mmCIF file of all heavy atoms in Angstrom:
data_model
loop_
_atom_site.group_PDB
_atom_site.id
_atom_site.type_symbol
_atom_site.label_atom_id
_atom_site.label_comp_id
_atom_site.label_asym_id
_atom_site.label_seq_id
_atom_site.Cartn_x
_atom_site.Cartn_y
_atom_site.Cartn_z
ATOM 1 N N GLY A 373 10.846 -20.752 -22.950
ATOM 2 C CA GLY A 373 9.609 -19.917 -22.680
ATOM 3 C C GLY A 373 8.559 -20.783 -22.074
ATOM 4 O O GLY A 373 8.600 -22.044 -22.124
ATOM 5 N N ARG A 374 7.715 -20.049 -21.393
ATOM 6 C CA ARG A 374 6.492 -20.651 -20.691
ATOM 7 C C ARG A 374 5.305 -20.864 -21.612
ATOM 8 O O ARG A 374 5.280 -20.279 -22.643
ATOM 9 C CB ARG A 374 6.104 -19.797 -19.453
ATOM 10 C CG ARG A 374 7.088 -19.989 -18.285
ATOM 11 C CD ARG A 374 7.180 -18.713 -17.474
ATOM 12 N NE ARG A 374 7.853 -17.554 -18.066
ATOM 13 C CZ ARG A 374 8.102 -16.409 -17.541
ATOM 14 N NH1 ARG A 374 7.829 -16.219 -16.259
ATOM 15 N NH2 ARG A 374 8.680 -15.421 -18.183
ATOM 16 N N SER A 375 4.407 -21.690 -21.144
ATOM 17 C CA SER A 375 3.166 -22.004 -21.847
ATOM 18 C C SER A 375 2.018 -21.171 -21.347
ATOM 19 O O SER A 375 1.621 -21.216 -20.194
ATOM 20 C CB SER A 375 2.751 -23.538 -21.684
ATOM 21 O OG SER A 375 1.597 -23.819 -22.356
ATOM 22 N N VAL A 376 1.497 -20.280 -22.165
ATOM 23 C CA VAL A 376 0.342 -19.435 -21.823
ATOM 24 C C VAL A 376 -0.885 -20.314 -21.669
ATOM 25 O O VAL A 376 -1.733 -20.088 -20.830
ATOM 26 C CB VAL A 376 0.114 -18.368 -22.896
ATOM 27 C CG1 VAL A 376 -1.141 -17.491 -22.677
ATOM 28 C CG2 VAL A 376 1.355 -17.367 -23.024
ATOM 29 N N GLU A 377 -1.035 -21.358 -22.572
ATOM 30 C CA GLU A 377 -2.192 -22.221 -22.474
ATOM 31 C C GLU A 377 -2.295 -22.949 -21.123
ATOM 32 O O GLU A 377 -3.307 -22.970 -20.532
ATOM 33 C CB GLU A 377 -2.093 -23.276 -23.608
ATOM 34 C CG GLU A 377 -1.885 -22.813 -25.027
ATOM 35 C CD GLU A 377 -3.126 -22.075 -25.606
ATOM 36 O OE1 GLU A 377 -4.066 -21.721 -24.786
ATOM 37 O OE2 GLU A 377 -3.147 -21.788 -26.870
ATOM 38 N N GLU A 378 -1.197 -23.467 -20.700
ATOM 39 C CA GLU A 378 -1.100 -24.132 -19.380
ATOM 40 C C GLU A 378 -1.359 -23.193 -18.258
ATOM 41 O O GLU A 378 -2.043 -23.655 -17.315
ATOM 42 C CB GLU A 378 0.339 -24.825 -19.225
ATOM 43 C CG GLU A 378 0.468 -25.591 -17.875
ATOM 44 C CD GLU A 378 -0.643 -26.620 -17.712
ATOM 45 O OE1 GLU A 378 -1.078 -27.282 -18.704
ATOM 46 O OE2 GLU A 378 -1.151 -26.754 -16.542
ATOM 47 N N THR A 379 -0.890 -21.974 -18.328
ATOM 48 C CA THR A 379 -1.138 -20.970 -17.284
ATOM 49 C C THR A 379 -2.688 -20.662 -17.135
ATOM 50 O O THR A 379 -3.217 -20.644 -15.960
ATOM 51 C CB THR A 379 -0.508 -19.591 -17.486
ATOM 52 O OG1 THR A 379 0.961 -19.840 -17.854
ATOM 53 C CG2 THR A 379 -0.587 -18.640 -16.423
ATOM 54 N N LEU A 380 -3.365 -20.633 -18.220
ATOM 55 C CA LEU A 380 -4.800 -20.362 -18.243
ATOM 56 C C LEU A 380 -5.615 -21.545 -17.771
ATOM 57 O O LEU A 380 -6.565 -21.499 -16.934
ATOM 58 C CB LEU A 380 -5.229 -19.948 -19.636
ATOM 59 C CG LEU A 380 -6.738 -19.640 -19.983
ATOM 60 C CD1 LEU A 380 -7.153 -18.339 -19.316
ATOM 61 C CD2 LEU A 380 -6.945 -19.521 -21.525
ATOM 62 N N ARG A 381 -5.115 -22.786 -18.166
ATOM 63 C CA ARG A 381 -5.738 -24.018 -17.687
ATOM 64 C C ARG A 381 -5.689 -24.133 -16.209
ATOM 65 O O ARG A 381 -6.709 -24.486 -15.606
ATOM 66 C CB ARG A 381 -4.992 -25.232 -18.350
ATOM 67 C CG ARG A 381 -5.568 -26.583 -18.053
ATOM 68 C CD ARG A 381 -4.587 -27.766 -18.422
ATOM 69 N NE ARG A 381 -3.666 -27.955 -17.356
ATOM 70 C CZ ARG A 381 -3.905 -28.615 -16.248
ATOM 71 N NH1 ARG A 381 -5.163 -29.104 -15.992
ATOM 72 N NH2 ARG A 381 -3.015 -28.744 -15.304
ATOM 73 N N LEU A 382 -4.534 -23.674 -15.579
ATOM 74 C CA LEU A 382 -4.443 -23.714 -14.169
ATOM 75 C C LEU A 382 -5.396 -22.703 -13.467
ATOM 76 O O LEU A 382 -6.037 -23.089 -12.489
ATOM 77 C CB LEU A 382 -3.023 -23.437 -13.717
ATOM 78 C CG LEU A 382 -2.081 -24.606 -14.037
ATOM 79 C CD1 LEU A 382 -0.587 -24.127 -13.838
ATOM 80 C CD2 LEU A 382 -2.283 -25.863 -13.142
ATOM 81 N N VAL A 383 -5.526 -21.488 -13.982
ATOM 82 C CA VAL A 383 -6.403 -20.436 -13.411
ATOM 83 C C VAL A 383 -7.857 -20.922 -13.462
ATOM 84 O O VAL A 383 -8.502 -20.909 -12.444
ATOM 85 C CB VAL A 383 -6.329 -18.995 -14.129
ATOM 86 C CG1 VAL A 383 -7.382 -18.105 -13.564
ATOM 87 C CG2 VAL A 383 -4.928 -18.466 -13.835
ATOM 88 N N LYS A 384 -8.303 -21.343 -14.586
ATOM 89 C CA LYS A 384 -9.639 -21.930 -14.755
ATOM 90 C C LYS A 384 -9.794 -23.158 -13.852
ATOM 91 O O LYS A 384 -10.984 -23.293 -13.275
ATOM 92 C CB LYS A 384 -9.822 -22.453 -16.228
ATOM 93 C CG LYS A 384 -10.037 -21.351 -17.213
ATOM 94 C CD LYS A 384 -10.391 -21.901 -18.578
ATOM 95 C CE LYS A 384 -10.695 -20.774 -19.519
ATOM 96 N NZ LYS A 384 -10.997 -21.363 -20.816
ATOM 97 N N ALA A 385 -8.879 -23.984 -13.600
ATOM 98 C CA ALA A 385 -8.891 -25.156 -12.664
ATOM 99 C C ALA A 385 -9.011 -24.716 -11.213
ATOM 100 O O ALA A 385 -9.879 -25.254 -10.448
ATOM 101 C CB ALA A 385 -7.675 -26.017 -12.824
ATOM 102 N N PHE A 386 -8.283 -23.664 -10.729
ATOM 103 C CA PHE A 386 -8.412 -23.180 -9.331
ATOM 104 C C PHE A 386 -9.775 -22.603 -9.041
ATOM 105 O O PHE A 386 -10.213 -22.671 -7.898
ATOM 106 C CB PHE A 386 -7.200 -22.239 -8.985
ATOM 107 C CG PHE A 386 -5.916 -22.962 -8.737
ATOM 108 C CD1 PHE A 386 -4.790 -22.760 -9.574
ATOM 109 C CD2 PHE A 386 -5.730 -23.862 -7.709
ATOM 110 C CE1 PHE A 386 -3.642 -23.366 -9.351
ATOM 111 C CE2 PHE A 386 -4.571 -24.506 -7.423
ATOM 112 C CZ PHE A 386 -3.488 -24.263 -8.348
#
Side-chain angles (χ1 to χ4, degrees):
Chain A
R374 283 152 292 187
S375 181
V376 175
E377 305 290 12
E378 185 50 42
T379 309
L380 181 66
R381 190 193 80 75
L382 292 167
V383 172
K384 287 187 172 179
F386 285 114

